[PDB]
Structure 1
């Protein structure tokens, strides 16, 4: 069916985000001379989930008998990612191997962590039983709370945080230096449709009415991808919430080299950024969707993203609850920034990276499922491998096109997340006056 693939083949990548920039870089390194990346926004896109001052990176090797094929595939992805965060000149400056603490504050949450995360892992964890145990994982003055009911485990090596925003910019800069062409801005990079001829994809149409033709088209537009192809319910666009506190110029100096602290039913925080000294808190919960009528499925819903630099008041309150337990000296500080951030979950929260069975010139690379950002250095290599029909066996069948898994999908499934109301929430039920008002009157 499709044209024969070579490095002279014209390629279009839809979406210059986390995975799109990685893909552009890897295709350039592999000697693909004719690559064009389309995005409605210039890098770093304000709607990219990767456009964040930090994200968590973690890699765990799994014991024999404690893996299933899905978790083994995940460890294959993170193994490669870890190696590259420590080595690849484009990414290495942006990885901080400070460690990672996973915790919960009820016996049920703590048991879940023990069974799913700790017992299966070859990692040698340090157990944290008391408030003092938690506080001693960071410099004096940083963790001050009583951690009521908390127990957790510290993973020192092979985990930490990444400066996702700077690493994405780094990848973009290097892909463009190596000759990739970026068309970024609206309407010129805002893709509204895939373009088909003879039952295959021949490129993309942007909002200005231009048709961009290529021999292969890669769809890597994060949550926005769901509007450009019928994924047969394989994607659920879903939002999480983040806010920032501005640290002062003396107090900030203690907050350095910090392991990530994560309570699976409350949230996490990462150390203040180097440029604005802003400390980011994510309140953990199963996610917000924005459920509107599915234009192609009568009587059914489909979640549609929208951008906003505020968060619901209830999400701010959850963030402050996390701070009260951990850093109560910060819990009443004004927010300096907040936003909603969109990803898309597959039914099993494995990635979806495959050639389309009906349209072989289309490659989809979607379904970050809440753990795509840590894949940045290497995900473009896996995506390029799939383009070249050689995605490795340890991942190919896990991340395949799999519409059978999403028949009668329950959009309100909590998909192994916890916190907040312990249910999927709907932005259509959030009042207009129910948001933070940062920077307003």
Structure 2
């Protein structure tokens, strides 16, 4: 039964892992029976979710995406734990190119084709006046030739704060923790030499933890820890910050997230006047020598270069260029603002950008909860619910089928993005 079942959540200080730990508690698992093992205390300083903010927006790329999004939305609006961290300011995608405007229009049509009434809260903006109505900080000259798609249900998420809120609850309830070397997964433990029954994990300090079930929610590190047979390729994206005075920030209060696929995006200034800017690009790998467990030999693998461990890193020179291009596009009045807290942030792509959430094909009792594919912070409130369903054999097929073990199902270096990721070894400037 749930109350007598012991679970280890590897990466439980991160997004999918903390969600999982939360939902084990909500399901009635005994807190002292749950062990979170993360290199960093929750919220993990190297988690992709350890961020001022993230966008919450609708995507309809894969079969489970609509249901997952609606499920998350309901919780971001209505769950008392999560609702303080959702800012429903909406989002406006924009473009001034022929191809970009075509994509905008096709995206809108795809929402409509779901047939559930999404046209009530999503709108094509075909004129300057309509765009300025939603985003009054723009100038008319600035947006000449732009078209927009306004999604009224989205906005932004206070990401680190939300994971911290889960963490405060886990600790209040008496969930057990290991951090540092005692929290850093090294290998699964097995009952027999055939490795068909997982009974726990060993961390790099040698500490052994025994449990009925193990969840590997290690984000961009998952592929380095166990052999995922090239299903997941980890990549970095980048952000920088600029600091506004209260008077500068005033025109941006409650303004929608602004996104252009050719540039990137920015989010409204936070309570301290900070605007985060990201560019848009296919990500950076960091291939290095590494042996994951389950591979008989080392494999070339994209291993995250962790900013928390190496806070003197920033990002490549090429990233400075594209982030400044986004600033010129969206915020040209702030072209002279200094960029700071530049960082790389790590995700792991699958070939089709569906998650990888499944029992290991051989190691019974060991479960994967990863393949975030750079779009899963928005699933913080609900993804753990389905990981628990998977643990219990109750995961419905729409999710189970999409999330299944699937080596050889496509090239995750390119994934659903515009090009195979370039590698940091070829991109000067980030060691700075």
Instruction: Tell me, yes or no, if structure 1 residue 233 matches structure 2 residue 230.
Output: yes
Instruction: Tell me, yes or no, if structure 1 residue 165 matches structure 2 residue 156.
Output: no
Measured against aligned partners, the alpha-carbon deviations of 1:214-269 in whole angstroms (never above 9, x if no partner) come to 11100001011112211111111011000100111222222211211111121011
CA 1:105–1:6: 2 relative to 1, 3 Å: same
Instruction: Tell me, yes or no, if structure 1 residue 430 matches structure 2 residue 422.
Output: no
In 1: Cα distance, 2:333 partner to 2:92 partner:
21
1:390 match = 394
How many Å apart are 1:126 and its aligned residue? 2.8
Instruction: Tell me, yes or no, if structure 1 residue 258 matches structure 2 residue 242.
Output: no
1:151 match = 147
1:71 match = 62
In 2: Cα distance, 1:426 partner to 1:277 partner:
33
What SS class does the counterpart of residue 225 from structure 1 fall into?
helix
CA 1:12–1:143: 2 relative to 1, 3 Å: farther
| Mean CA deviation greater in 147-156 or 265-274 | 147-156
1:341 pairs with one of 323, 341, 345: 345
Measured against aligned partners, the alpha-carbon deviations of 1:174-209 in whole angstroms (never above 9, x if no partner) come to 12222322222x122112222223222221111211
2:409 match = 405
1:221 match = 218
What SS class does the counterpart of residue 21 from structure 2 fall into?
helix
Contact kept, 8 Å, 1:144 with 1:326, in 2: the verdict is no
In structure 1, list runs of 5 or more residues that go unmatched: 63-69
1:120 match = 110
2:86 match = 95
Measured against aligned partners, the alpha-carbon deviations of 1:250-305 in whole angstroms (never above 9, x if no partner) come to 2222221121111112101101111x321000100011111235656989742111
CA 1:144–1:170: 2 relative to 1, 3 Å: farther
2:332 match = 328
1:350 match = 354
| Mean CA deviation greater in 280-289 or 198-207 | 198-207
Mapping of residues 292-307 of structure 1, within 5 Å: 292-293=288-289, 295=291, 301-307=300-306
Contact kept, 8 Å, 1:145 with 1:328, in 2: the verdict is no
1:27 pairs with one of 24, 39, 56: 24
CA 1:396–1:112: 2 relative to 1, 3 Å: same
2:170 pairs with one of 161, 167, 175: 175
In 2: Cα distance, 1:26 partner to 1:321 partner:
41
In 2: Cα distance, 1:241 partner to 1:95 partner:
22
| Mean CA deviation greater in 343-352 or 395-404 | 395-404
Contact kept, 8 Å, 1:291 with 1:302, in 2: the verdict is yes
How many Å apart are 1:410 and its aligned residue? 6.0
Contact kept, 8 Å, 1:354 with 1:399, in 2: the verdict is yes
In 1: Cα distance, 2:8 partner to 2:336 partner:
47
In 2: Cα distance, 1:302 partner to 1:159 partner:
35
In structure 2, list runs of 5 or more residues that go unmatched: 113-117, 308-312
Aligned length: 411
In 2: Cα distance, 1:97 partner to 1:196 partner:
47
1:65 match = none
In 2: Cα distance, 1:32 partner to 1:298 partner:
38
In 2: Cα distance, 1:358 partner to 1:217 partner:
13
How many Å apart are 1:357 and its aligned residue? 2.0
Measured against aligned partners, the alpha-carbon deviations of 1:146-191 in whole angstroms (never above 9, x if no partner) come to 14653221111x211111110000111112222322222x122112
CA 1:149–1:299: 2 relative to 1, 3 Å: farther
TM-score by structure 1 length?
0.87
In 1: Cα distance, 2:39 partner to 2:265 partner:
30
In 2: Cα distance, 1:145 partner to 1:136 partner:
15
Instruction: Tell me, yes or no, if structure 1 residue 364 matches structure 2 residue 354.
Output: no
Mapping of residues 46-57 of structure 1, within 5 Å: 46-57=45-56
2:190 pairs with one of 184, 196, 199: 196
In 2: Cα distance, 1:423 partner to 1:322 partner:
22
In 2: Cα distance, 1:181 partner to 1:143 partner:
53
More helix by percentage: 2
CA 1:131–1:46: 2 relative to 1, 3 Å: farther
CA 1:145–1:203: 2 relative to 1, 3 Å: farther
In 1: Cα distance, 2:315 partner to 2:143 partner:
25
TM-score by structure 2 length?
0.89
What SS class does the counterpart of residue 241 from structure 1 fall into?
strand
Contact kept, 8 Å, 1:138 with 1:259, in 2: the verdict is yes
Contact kept, 8 Å, 1:147 with 1:326, in 2: the verdict is no
Mapping of residues 264-283 of structure 1, within 5 Å: 264-274=261-271, 276-283=272-279
In 1: Cα distance, 2:141 partner to 2:177 partner:
47
1:187 pairs with one of 175, 181, 187: 181
What SS class does the counterpart of residue 51 from structure 2 fall into?
coil
